Design a protein around this ligand. Structure first.
Ligand SMILES: Cc1cc2nc3c(=O)[nH]c(=O)nc-3n(C[C@H](O)[C@H](O)[C@H](O)COP(=O)(O)OP(=O)(O)OC[C@H]3O[C@@H](n4cnc5c(N)ncnc54)[C@H](O)[C@@H]3O)c2cc1C
Ligand SMILES: CC[C@H](C)[C@@H](O)C(=O)O
Length: 456
């Protein structure tokens, strides 16, 4: 990367905000995935949207790949600079604006996390529900199409993104639903906002997100329920959903996951396949829901509920940190995570099969999941220096993904494709789907410089 180009970058953002130092590039060449670190040639921190546009235009017209970088908590190698280029760390634009409590909406820049937004919303009666366990950039969450434990009731990012501000690959500024617009529904034109949700930085740079806010629940109760088997827990989950209990959270942990979370949180739940549950409503609705849900879990062999302000906070903090709890089983390890999502009536088949295959395999794994969505993750620990283990893990993940596809499902419910699921995506949507996705990529990024090598 030439001196002249680096100085042009410095003219846009300032010398402190451009670095070609190896350590800085290495820190921005990987995420939380096991994908190999691939450092960008430079890291750049733009300070406002005009600077993002100018950096994009400089890179694009000079043939230099662009890698958008939020908080680096992705798990599919989205930020790995597989073709080098300029990593654009967006987190210095960290402002909340256009808070409209009367409309239930807010605009956030990439440096705002869910924790920051909800802290700024303390005492407002509103909150933002989509809750990855990581302290992630909200614009990064829009880019990956994230969900979370609350999505079963309150929706995913796709359900809660109203508008996006996007710097297109050549630097043009696009407000996907129109500048300053926010509303509950529209039929106006083609829905551009949905195209950029889940685009993972391959179609443009999200420089602000307009988010739907939600009313705080009148009352909340959390609980845990232990089961004798995976299939008892998952049958209970499906029956709760088919009974239309409007649970706020319903999360599955197998016995391995539950042991791991116990060791990492000083929770002390029975080591068994477990559901973590949360209910929102008034006192009358909560009593109604709790007794319907207890009846269903009891029918399938669930233990009595173990009840959970500080204790529900510890419960969900343990769940949110499940990734790190699993990693702490074998220290020094990395991990790959699967993320399939299937029609809910097929969830018992595939979760039980996954448990049986983990146990039959020489591999170690923990199972945890947003099962209210028909979604779950297998966390598969890896020795970073064991190439034989690595391709056995990758074969296990690919076979699980193909089983989900055979059941009518998708290879990823929330994490995205990045580097790891590109072949599974081709199988999932077939040749006309792939070509159509490619056509969209090419019209927005003709030179192919917008995070190359990802998704497609
Ligand atoms: C402990 C833990 C728990 C997690 N739990 C969940 C969970 O429950 N649900 C879930 O969905 N994910 C979860 N994740 C994954 C991760 O937190 C999400 O995918 C999150 O949305 C990533 O945001 P980020 O800014 O950190 O992404 P990064 O790793 O910085 O980037 C991810 C991808 O999006 C692109 N990108 C980032 N910011 C932008 C932007 N502003 N504009 C355009 N492209 C951009 C990058 O180029 C890359 O391709 C978890 C991760 C961890 C470590
Ligand atoms: C980073 C993978 C894990 C499984 C995350 O998705 C979660 O649900 O806590």
């Amino acid at each position: 990367l030439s001196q002249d180009f680096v100085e042009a970058l410095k003219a846009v953002v300032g010398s402190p905000h451009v670095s070609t130092a190896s350590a800085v590039r290495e820190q921005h060449g990987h995420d939380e995935s096991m994908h190999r670190c691939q450092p960008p040639d430079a890291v750049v921190w733009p300070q406002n949207v005009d600077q993002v546009s100018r950096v994009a235009s400089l890179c694009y017209n000079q043939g230099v790949p662009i890698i958008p970088f939020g908080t680096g908590t992705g798990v599919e190698g989205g930020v790995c600079a597989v073709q080098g280029g300029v990593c654009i760390n967006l987190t210095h634009m960290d402002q909340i604006t256009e808070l409209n409590t009367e409309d239930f909406s807010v605009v956030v820049e990439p440096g705002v996390t869910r924790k920051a937004l909800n802290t700024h919303l303390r005492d407002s009666g509103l909150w933002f529900p989509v809750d990855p366990g990581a302290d992630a950039s909200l614009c990064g969450m829009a880019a990956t199409g994230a969900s979370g434990t609350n999505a079963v009731r309150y929706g995913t990012m796709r359900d809660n993104v109203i508008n996006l501000e996007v710097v297109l690959p050549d630097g043009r500024l696009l407000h996907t639903a129109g500048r300053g617009r926010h509303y509950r529904k529209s039929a106006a034109g083609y829905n551009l906002t949905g195209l950029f949700v889940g685009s993972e930085g391959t179609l443009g740079i999200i420089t602000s997100t307009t988010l739907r806010l939600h009313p705080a629940p009148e009352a909340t109760v959390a609980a845990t329920c232990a089961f004798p088997s995976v299939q008892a827990a998952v049958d209970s989950t499906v029956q709760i959903l088919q009974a239309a209990v409007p649970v706020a959270r319903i999360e599955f942990l197998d016995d391995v996951m539950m042991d791991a979370c116990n060791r990492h949180s000083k929770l002390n739940c029975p080591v068994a396949p477990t559901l973590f549950l949360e209910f929102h409503g008034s006192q009358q609705t909560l009593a109604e829901q709790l007794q319907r849900t207890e009846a269903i879990t009891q029918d399938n062999g669930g233990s009595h509920f173990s009840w959970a302000a500080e204790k529900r906070n510890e419960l969900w903090a343990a769940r949110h940190n499940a990734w790190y709890a699993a990693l702490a089983l074998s220290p020094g390890s990395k991990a790959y995570s699967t993320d399939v999502c299937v029609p809910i009536s097929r969830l018992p088949e595939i979760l039980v099969e996954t448990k049986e295959e983990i146990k039959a395999s020489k591999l170690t794994g923990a199972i945890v999941g947003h099962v209210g969505d028909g979604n779950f993750a297998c966390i598969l620990l890896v020795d970073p220096d064991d190439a034989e283990e690595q391709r056995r893990v990758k074969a296990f993940a690919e076979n699980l993904g193909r089983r989900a596809l055979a059941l009518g499902g998708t290879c990823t419910g929330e994490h995205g494709i990045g580097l790891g699921k590109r072949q599974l995506l081709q199988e999932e949507v077939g040749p006309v789907g792939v070509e159509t996705m490619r056509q969209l990529k090419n019209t927005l990024d003709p030179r192919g410089l917008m995070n190359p090598g990802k998704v497609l």
